[PDB]
């Protein structure tokens, strides 16, 4: 039944991860989520790994094509870039559909809520990277809302060294800089996040310390690049 089917899909997603077949992994994880049970921390990570690898591959390809198209200014680049764009949009719409119909909930843990809301902001941000007109404006607003709701929860419920909180503040600052064209907000957010995490690092254990410091190095690299 549903419980047996779900267990199989999770095992298959773990096999697909080992085999580095991320589109398969994503499909198994989508099916597992559609069984209706809450995802465990391990399962959330399987879902995130699966789709981030799929969309990451598409985004990298789109950037290559978009760069050739921008430099060459025939029809082939535009047509092919459009095909890649459509595939990317479909993956983002799938993730967003899963988040809205199954994963985004009022209950329970602030960790899982911030996790899903950040994921919502991320996939709307990926859509914004390739969007153009009034659609782009709607997408930018949706990413901003998801990130802000996640920021409000993380500031109230998580310590400033928490990697979900750090990762969220990093992505939202990427959003401000790259998408919303607010470099000042991006720099300010990245500095604040880094400073607040820096003040608390001594309270961490060797395990937690390595997690937090990794994301702080990323914040710092982005500030070097943006200032």
């Amino acid at each position: 039944g549903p419980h047996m089917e779900r267990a199989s899909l999770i095992q298959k997603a773990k096999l697909a991860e080992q085999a580095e077949r991320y589109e398969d992994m994503a499909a198994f994880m989508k099916g597992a989520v559609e069984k209706g049970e809450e995802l465990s921390c391990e399962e959330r990570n399987l879902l995130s790994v699966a789709y981030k690898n799929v969309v990451g591959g598409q985004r990298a390809a789109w950037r290559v094509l978009s760069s050739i198209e921008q430099k060459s200014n025939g029809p082939e680049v535009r047509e092919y870039r459009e095909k890649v764009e459509t595939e990317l949009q479909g993956v983002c719409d799938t993730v967003l559909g899963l988040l809205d119909s199954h994963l985004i909930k009022e209950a329970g843990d602030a960790e899982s809520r911030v996790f899903y809301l950040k994921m919502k902001g991320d996939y709307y941000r990926y859509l914004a990277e390739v969007a153009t007109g009034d659609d782009k404006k709607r997408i930018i607003d949706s990413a901003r809302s998801a990130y802000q709701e996640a920021m409000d929860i993380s500031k109230k419920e998580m310590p400033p060294t928490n990697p979900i909180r750090l990762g969220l503040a990093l992505n939202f600052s990427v959003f401000h800089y790259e998408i919303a064209n607010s470099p000042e907000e991006a720099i300010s957010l990245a500095k604040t996040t880094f400073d607040e995490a820096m003040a608390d690092l001594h309270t961490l254990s060797e395990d937690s310390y390595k997690d937090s410091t990794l994301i702080m190095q990323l914040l710092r690299d982005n500030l070097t690049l943006w200032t």
Binding site: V49, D122, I164, L166, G167, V174, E178, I215, D221, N222
Partner: peptide, 8 residues
Amino acid sequence: RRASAPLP
């Protein structure tokens, strides 16, 4: 290229 949050 700018960094975004790494995989959990």
